[PDB]
Amino acid sequence: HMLSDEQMQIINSLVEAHHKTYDDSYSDFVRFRPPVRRLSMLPHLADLVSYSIQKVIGFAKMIPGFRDLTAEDQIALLKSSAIEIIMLRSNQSFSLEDMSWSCGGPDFKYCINDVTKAGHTLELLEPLVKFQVGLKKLKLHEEEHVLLMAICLLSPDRPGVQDHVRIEALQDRLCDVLQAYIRIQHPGGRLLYAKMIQKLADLRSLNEEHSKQYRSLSFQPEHSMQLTPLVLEVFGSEV
Amino acid sequence: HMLSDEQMQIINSLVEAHHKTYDDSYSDFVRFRPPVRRLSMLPHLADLVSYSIQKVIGFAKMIPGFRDLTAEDQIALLKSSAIEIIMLRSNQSFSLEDMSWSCGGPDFKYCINDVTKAGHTLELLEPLVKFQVGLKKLKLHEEEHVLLMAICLLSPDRPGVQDHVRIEALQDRLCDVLQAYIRIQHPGGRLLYAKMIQKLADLRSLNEEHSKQYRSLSFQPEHSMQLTPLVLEVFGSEV
């Protein structure tokens, strides 16, 4: 068959929303507190994550049907998925070549080691790379990548969500466009969809793991003081 | 007459405490979010102030008799005087030559203009320079400058102080050493003391003015998000 207008205008909006919020030159990174190779990377990475949340929020605001949700459900969805969306978009800067996130010269190239000097260990930093590699290999079209993010964000299974029925409906509509698009426009993608939805499950573990690690970090004031107000708010437990 | 042992060992400790917490090369400034000339300097100056609070705390911890105060009075004294102490120590980087704070190349030289792009206006930025100039002119010895700071910090007239009698006693002892020192070691300083105590009154206005300006800034989340956890805590109203 072939895509419908309503469906296609979802893709235009999402692709445009991503372009308006993701810079392939990573030029704004010079405004972050400089990276330093207890937890010397914490200051810089905290700024990177903070910056990203802001970007994920601008993108979310442009997902069709999201601005119609209650301020509360919008907050609940962002708080629970923020980290997952940061991880998804980060794939664009990930390099299978050097297994790192290359956002600039040697200064902004992020190795597994670096994330360690920011409060995280190898044991759990391992799944992040595996996720990045598996995701990178799927060679997603910009349209599929931007859709997966919109779908992740609209997961109705999030702590704190109220109108889980409406969220469920929206996520469903987006899942259609993603399925249709693969079928129509993606040659050789018979299993792709299932593989993508699979990636959403991997993001949950990565999410949970991060929560535990972050919790520890935040309870130690000498460390939480290195974070930013937005990060402390988005990953905080206040309800 | 001449100084006593107890008195002199107060001076050794204070001078050493300042040396251990003030770097004349301002080398750590490269770790702050870079300066940018709504409120583009806010990010960098917020880091400068944050850094300073940390330094003022390390100094305070070394003021004789301070660590014996209750954790509460220590917090109350720091919260109310922090800004004044930041202003006093800043005199060391102030230049009557160019009316600015020269902490590095053109990048870390702070003009009145810059503080404006950080949420503050000229109307009240004016008294800060006048204070800096008047203070600079007094050509204080390192011993007198470090004493004035210790005295400012131990003002018993601070909102939230409990044991105001003990604070009052400590500040009094320091006032002795300052008075004695001027007399014994400071040739030509008959009015100096009175001039110094005068400066404490100017710091109160500067303090009050800052409070009002800061209050406005902090109530606007798009701005407070640019501040640091420590700054938000020290200048915050939580009791």
């Binding site: 929020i57 988005v234 | 998000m225």
Partner: peptide, 10 residues
């Protein structure tokens, strides 16, 4: 609270 998020969300 969530003061900052409410703001960023317009």
């Amino acid at each position: 609270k969530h003061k900052i998020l409410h703001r960023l969300l317009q």
